[PDB]
Design a protein around this ligand. Structure first.
Ligand SMILES: O=C(O)c1cccc(O)c1
Ligand SMILES: O=C(O)c1cccc(O)c1
Ligand SMILES: [Mg+2]
Ligand SMILES: [Zn+2]
Ligand SMILES: [Zn+2]
Ligand SMILES: [Zn+2]
Ligand SMILES: [Zn+2]
Lengths: 503, 494
């Protein structure tokens, strides 16, 4: 039941006097604009005077309880839709993480760097099911809630799981407790690329993987909040049998779902796919019937001309993460230039954070990265306008997630999912485009207020219902158990680091 | 300033080994660093102080902070006088009708050349009071973001106004003068000489004379050429003679744009780095802004001369510049061991600061090479501190936390969610922090910023004087109607 998490109706709210970015079809921006919300929905958005006319249509009772929020020193955005994310905070001690020396001077190219260590990546992904099984229900819920809180704190109101090292129902429960929206998934890996083998090794039955997703779908079918959906994913096309691909196509058609995977992510992927599967990623997905309007492809940069045409013909979707490629040693923007090229050719392309095991670039940081990096590559300050970067992190992401019915833009009849950012400091002075100043000089921590379905979850940069110190301390205790027991890191290395945390 | 001990934080030195000290310390005495390293080494230096100096020691527990060297932003322009007209305050809030212009699309070489040659007239039109108010606010914004040493590479402001602003603010400043003696006009097949080289050089020599006597150690000067398009051979040779005679650094912009080389061949008969080399300017004194559109011979001239490149990857995309990826030359020359630093460049409203530029280099150089080790976070810091200081010829006194160097340092708080469990707070800073997260700024042992607020600076007062000055200059010199300016000023969130 929804009342376990939150109680009460939100009534009418008028948020007025700020610059309002709608991310509607026309990318509408309203200086001295306003948003009127009633309960969970936007009723009116536009110039303040026009929206005051909508306020005049409210009855004596709704008017008497109207909450007026003076946003005159603020910018209003739609809530961010981060459709390509992974819960990986259980790996905080080992994944580019807490045990590294403070000096970075001895760092090496590994994992996704240097074109990608395809055997290591494939083997690591196939080990997720065993580690998820090893995680306790208590550990999963504590780690999920803190990890997803960090997304919400940065203005993510709708979050999409594209394959997590956590228990699916733990992440669903965390989303319910936090008040945010969540597209849940399950871990899907049924093949590994092993150095001593001439084809992929099947590591589990496709039907097992599919049944796991069907169990999640069953669990959240009934959900009455409107905040929980699900979307099946394949971890990575290296770890995907033809039986899993065909099974996913059947499942998505039968249940009318979106679909997500990672493909064309790495320079070294194509040769490994040919060696172990006989065919590259997009062509394997296309053979299974998965290159269509339902597909959100993560990264999707290492595509040849034929694979680019398959994506365009299918009206598929790419989620791109340009804020985080460099620190991973990925080259999914500039080495091929394919994602900006497919966007110019009319493919839907959104911006996402991807994830790792400690806080990294959020949606705000990713919007800045796209604005800088796409425009520099083309010598064109108009290729990604700031309002395009916002659309890519809101409406366009919602379209790829098949949630644009309800979220991603401030328009009448959509969910009242909004951010407020303060614009009264030196960064914003004299700029009629506060979103541009935000991309120059602000980020996740400058999100002031986060509203989901008309409910304030963050205000003044602080959780309203979230107990921030308590969520952190439960996450750290859970991480201690999982790290010492499942990852076999000695307590001697873990406990003094947790003791030195600044509380 | 007496003695200050800053102890318990993670200390990034940007010394020659890029040393990082977890739970490290810095001891300063008066204007200088005396000890930096592990707490035990630094406590030995505390016990070596004059007893009266130790009795008055200012102890700062930085255990919830990160300590950095002060940022050295060696390629900057004061352009805040153009806030109403230059990608500025009069634009519509919607960006949908924006066009490729100015430096975008390979560069409008005629417009760029003509615009640069108009700077002298607009500087002359600016009052001394307007210049001082605009400079002090503009330079405050750099200081607020952790810039302790700022380098002028050609400003739309009065040089002595910017020197006075630096003196008032307490920061370090390498002052320059505007130098443009040629224009590339569409109705001509050769450059047009607009001023005499000896007069342009005399303007710089007058500034050098004005700051020669400065007793603070905080004011230096460096001659620049605006842009090689606007540079005669006589100006270039005269600059080489001047910097040899006075033992100065030299700066210009060269190889900045796709369309530059063809315009340089058409109007001057030779490309920029080759023209600088002929004049004797491609040597260890040169800081070249952008310097990406270089052929193999020009790359070899830069390496042979041990010249320096200042790169601004935080701001190329919004300008429509392509000085990172279109040629890849600057990362390649850096891998080859050329000194390459990071700078903010300019514009007329706040844009990417040094912190933002460090993040940009870390993301963008590493993505281009599929190598998370090409620019480590500590490299991005060195590029914005020690290496920048070396290019500015100020590494004698600034750019790193080492005994004998100036006590110029930053404190950044690390006690929030962004930093949790990271043994590398600089990495969390590059992921999720920026200019506004600079908490404390110390120059020569003096605290100028603390808790993100000016100590002697009245930020609201500097702002209000800048806005008044901008109103006068915009209405009078830029001829923008009061009807367009006053409503924008009326809307300011005071
Ligand atoms: O975002 C990912 O999970 C991913 C998966 C495979 C390759 C890669 O570079 C990234
Ligand atoms: O940084 C500059 O002043 C500059 C000058 C010329 C070309 C360009 O792209 C930039
Ligand atoms: Mg409250
Ligand atoms: Zn991913
Ligand atoms: Zn409409
Ligand atoms: Zn410049
Ligand atoms: Zn390479």
């Amino acid at each position: 039941t929804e009342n376990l998490y939150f109680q009460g109706a939100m009534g009418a709210r008028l948020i007025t006097g700020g610059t309002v970015y709608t991310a509607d079809a026309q990318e509408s921006v309203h200086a001295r604009g306003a948003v009127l919300t009633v309960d969970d929905k936007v009723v009116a958005v536009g110039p303040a005077v026009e929206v005051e006319q909508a306020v005049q249509a409210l009855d004596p009772a709704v008017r008497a309880e109207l909450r007026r929020l003076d946003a005159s020193r603020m910018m209003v955005l739609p809530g961010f839709v981060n459709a390509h994310w992974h819960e990986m905070f259980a790996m905080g001690f080992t994944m580019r993480g807490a045990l590294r020396p403070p000096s970075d001077r001895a760092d090496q190219v590994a994992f996704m760097g240097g074109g990608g260590d395809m055997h290591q990546i494939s083997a690591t992904f196939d080990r997720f099911d065993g580690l998820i099984e090893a995680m306790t229900e208590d550990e999963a819920r504590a780690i999920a809630e803190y990890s997803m809180w960090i997304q919400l704190r940065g203005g993510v109101t709708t979050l999409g799981d594209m394959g997590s090292l956590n228990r699916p129902l733990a992440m669903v429960e965390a989303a319910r407790r936090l008040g945010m929206r969540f597209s849940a998934s399950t871990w899907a890996s049924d093949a590994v690329l092993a150095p001593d083998r001439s084809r992929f090794l099947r590591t589990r039955d496709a039907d097992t993987v599919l049944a796991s997703f069907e169990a999640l779908l069953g669990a959240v079918a009934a959900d009455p909040t409107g905040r929980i959906r699900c979307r099946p994913n394949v971890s990575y096309v290296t770890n995907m049998t033809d039986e899993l691909a065909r099974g996913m196509a059947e499942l998505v058609e039968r249940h009318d779902l979106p679909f997500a995977t990672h493909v064309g992510a790495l320079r070294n992927e194509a040769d490994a796919m040919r060696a172990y599967h006989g065919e590259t990623g997009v062509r394997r997905l296309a053979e299974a019937g998965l290159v269509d309007e339902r597909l959100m492809a993560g990264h999707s940069a290492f595509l040849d001309d034929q694979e680019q045409k398959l994506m365009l013909a299918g009206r598929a979707h790419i989620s791109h993460s340009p804020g985080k490629y460099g620190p991973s040693g990925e080259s999914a923007l500039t080495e091929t230039g394919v994602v900006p090229a497919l966007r110019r050719a009319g493919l839907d392309v959104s911006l996402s954070t991807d994830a790792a095991a400690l806080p990294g670039a959020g949606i705000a940081e990713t919007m800045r990265a796209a604005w800088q990096m796409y425009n520099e590559m083309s010598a064109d300050q108009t290729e990604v306008l700031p309002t395009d970067a916002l659309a890519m992190a809101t409406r366009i992401a919602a379209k790829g997630l098949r949630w644009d019915d309800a979220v991603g833009s401030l328009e009448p009849g959509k969910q009242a999912d909004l951010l407020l950012v303060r614009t009264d400091d030196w960064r914003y002075l004299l700029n009629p485009r506060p979103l541009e100043s935000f991309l120059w000089l602000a980020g996740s921590a400058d999100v002031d207020t986060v509203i989901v379905g008309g409910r304030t979850l963050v205000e003044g940069g602080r959780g309203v219902e979230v107990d921030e110190a308590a969520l952190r301390d439960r996450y750290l205790q859970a991480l201690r158990g999982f790290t010492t027991r499942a990852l076999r890191v000695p307590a001697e290395a873990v406990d003094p680091v947790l003791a030195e945390v600044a509380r």
